[PDB]
Design a protein around this nucleic acid. Structure first.
Lengths: 119, 139, 56, 47
RNA sequence: AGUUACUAAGGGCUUAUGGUGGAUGCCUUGGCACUAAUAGGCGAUGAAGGACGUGUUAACCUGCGAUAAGCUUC
RNA sequence: GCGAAACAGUACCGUGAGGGAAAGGUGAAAAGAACCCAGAGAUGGGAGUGAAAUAGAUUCUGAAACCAUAUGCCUACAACG
RNA sequence: AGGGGUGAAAUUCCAAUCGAAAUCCGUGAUAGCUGGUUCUCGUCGAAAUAGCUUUAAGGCUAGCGUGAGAUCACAAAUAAG
RNA sequence: UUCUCGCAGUCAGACAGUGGGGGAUAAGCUUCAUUGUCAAGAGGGGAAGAGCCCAGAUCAUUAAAUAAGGUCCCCAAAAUA
RNA sequence: UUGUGGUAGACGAGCGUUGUAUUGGAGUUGAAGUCAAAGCGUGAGCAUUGGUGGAUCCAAUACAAGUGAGAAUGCCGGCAUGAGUAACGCUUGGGAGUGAGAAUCUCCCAAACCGAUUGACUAAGGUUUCCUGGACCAGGGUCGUCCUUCCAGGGUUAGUC
RNA sequence: CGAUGACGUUGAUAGGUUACAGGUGUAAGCAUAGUGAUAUGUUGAGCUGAGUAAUACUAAUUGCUCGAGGACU
């Protein structure tokens, strides 16, 4: 079609997924869209499992998915992760986090759900 | 009973609101608020507020109970409209209508006012025939 | 395309017969006793089990 | 697109200015007819 | 074996009820045609008409004019 | 009825010749719904004044077409100005 | 600046528009041509022919059809010779 | 059915048959004269058949005789040699 | 007795509506008018009753109709239809706070762009739409506690520009 | 989209965990040499948007509704 919005795009979706996984690592609970939250949880679990090795290769892997926040920063993200987040789930082989289905969105009635984690 | 509470012509499309309005008919008051409190409808927060106001009106203004109130009748009366222009191709400037609705709901407690209206109509027609044949007496 | 006539009340109503509506799925929350929407959290803070959300 | 009216207000003032229209009898006649027509606006300087 | 129910989503048929809709029922310090007494101009002493202002009174209409919602004589 | 009963040559339009509409009515005097209640208030409802709230400011009355609701009648095997 | 102007010509352009712009007036110009003209009832009841016309879907005259006036059966057909 | 007076309306007819033409004796064709229809007349038949046949509608009738035509059913009516 | 089919057209008999002077009447003990009804007329019309409405109307005889409404691609107004239909007109996410209400409110921080201009001096034009506080009916293609929204208050200061 | 089908907690329906096929190819780092363009053991090294097995680690909940008395002869 003629010039119009690109909107949701593969690069846009992967950047947004990176934003959400970084956010959920920073805080621990994120209210988002469940449809993309499925793959968000998938990638979060994969990276957490990858973060458990705790070596320089792991630091390089984390280098590809960090973005700063209002107060918590990328260096703080990596430090806190390799300090207590990744070692926390060493006793859990998969099934790290859980999504709880919240109500539909006020603006568009999209299925908003909250992703959280515990161990 | 009636236990009505008008909204009196707010900006709202009757076609869209009338759907859930006819959904809520027949149902009780308590069994409908719980299901209404979850749907993501722009025509749901207003109905919830209307239900709260009507429950208050019945309990206090009319001294009703509320444990037996049911939705007697819900209607979305025809409201006025406003005409606006739209920037279209070739400067057509077509007209778009904006619809309102005189919203009101009815709540009943007694098992009556179904054939009671029929009896009232019968009383009216009996008054008509008594007035007619009364003038027919000793003609 | 284009119509040489209009739509009538009976035909639009019969079309709208499939514009009919449905009811939600409802479950009971005990810690905050209320009929919430099934497979979803309640507005009080519990999808299930432990309090997973605040009061509102 | 550049529209057929380019609002150069100096040209308008030289057009509907009173002294500009006072230099011709036709302009005065039209102004008197519009005054008879009770128009709120007579010139650009008299609205 | 026969066999009609309930169904009704919705429709239409009669009745009543409620919502625009302003329509007729009624009227207007409003316009229209006139009759009759009068007259047929004003103005460089700066007419009118506008701008501007003038509120115990925000805005507008109106009156007014630096004496500025009004002054003097009778 | 002059477009001109409402602040009509208004608004609006074409820079400009010029075109040029729309709508009044509460009540009897607002004497405007105090009281109480839901809600953020708007709004609405009981209460009261008011003869009358079919007199609540959308303000003498408020038709039908149109939109709905329900008494009963039937229709989901039916080629139908 | 319009029985005007502009135009390396294309009837280019001249207020989104040009075989000669728009605007008010003559003007309710004309219209053999289109379209339409709203309460009820009762009776009788044609033509689409002939002739003419710068005349052919137009107009005119006899004609018919009706209302009414007169003739009075000598009139007309009606059927037989 | 002739005259007197006014008002019209029609000349823009069609269809089938009869005597024709032109055509091409082809036409659901055309200029004609006659018959009949419609226009200005629906009715019954022809499965329907605007102009063919039978035929001429104050109205209601749930009466009969009839015309064209039909009488195994739709759809009204039959059999006998 | 002919009949009562008959367009064009000829012709006849009428009905109602208003006001004009009436003879008369009713009406807050309900008039005009509106809705309905299960009346009378071949018909123009008239009732009668029932409901609103609370203040004018009509019966009978002549006068005049801006008088009697089916079409004029008739005029205006309202209401639909299509119909939830094409589309929502150059672009994101998370977190904290406020509000009762969070994607359209603010705030923190990320990606994305222009960056010979998505920066700036300005001219011209709009000519206070500019700022603060309140509110968000109405305009915002949803949105709202928000606006370049409305209201109140306030704001642009030249000797060389 | 409605809808077909399976699984719905005592769950193998889907997903995460390791495991495998297959493929990108020799990775990062460590040490070697050429200062450096470079190749070497590591190094057939990883993992996958979607392939496959178990594992309940998570979700499909400690949810609700219609739905049976055989009418008539």
């Amino acid at each position: 079609s003629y010039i119009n919005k690109p909107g949701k795009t593969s690069a846009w979706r992967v950047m947004t997924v990176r934003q959400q996984v970084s956010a959920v690592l920073a805080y621990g609970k994120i209210e988002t869209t469940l449809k993309k939250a499925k793959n968000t949880q998938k990638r979060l679990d994969k990276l957490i499992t990858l973060a458990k090795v705790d070596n320089f290769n792991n630091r390089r892997q984390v280098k590809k998915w960090l973005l700063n926040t209002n107060l918590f920063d990328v260096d703080q993200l990596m430090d806190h992760l390799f300090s207590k987040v990744a070692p926390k789930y060493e006793k859990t082989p998969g099934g790290y986090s859980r999504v709880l289905k919240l109500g539909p969105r006020r603006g568009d009635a999209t299925e908003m759900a909250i992703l959280q984690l515990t161990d | 009973m009636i236990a009505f509470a008008k909204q009196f012509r707010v900006r709202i499309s009757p076609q869209k609101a009338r759907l859930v309005c006819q959904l809520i008919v027949g149902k009780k008051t308590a069994d409908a608020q719980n299901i209404l409190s979850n749907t993501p409808k722009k025509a749901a927060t207003l109905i919830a507020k209307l239900l709260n106001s009507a429950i208050a009106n019945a309990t206090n203004n009319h001294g009703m109970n509320g444990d037996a109130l049911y939705v007697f009748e819900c209607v979305a009366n025809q409201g006025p409209s406003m005409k606006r222009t739209i920037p279209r191709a070739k400067g057509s400037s077509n007209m778009i209508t904006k619809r309102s609705s005189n919203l009101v709901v009815k709540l009943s407690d007694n098992p009556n006012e179904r054939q009671e209206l029929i009896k009232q109509q019968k009383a009216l027609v009996k008054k008509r025939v008594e007035g007619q044949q009364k003038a027919k007496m000793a003609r | 395309a284009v119509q040489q006539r209009r739509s009538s009340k009976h035909r639009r109503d019969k079309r709208r017969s499939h514009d009919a509506l449905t009811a939600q799925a409802l479950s009971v929350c005990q810690k905050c006793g209320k009929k919430k929407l099934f497979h979803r959290v309640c507005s009080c803070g519990m999808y299930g089990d432990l309090r997973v959300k605040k009061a509102y | 697109m550049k529209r057929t009216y380019q609002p150069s207000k100096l040209k308008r003032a030289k057009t509907h200015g009173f002294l500009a229209r006072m230099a011709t009898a036709s302009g005065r006649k039209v102004l008197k007819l519009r005054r008879k027509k009770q128009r709120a606006q007579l010139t650009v300087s008299s609205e």
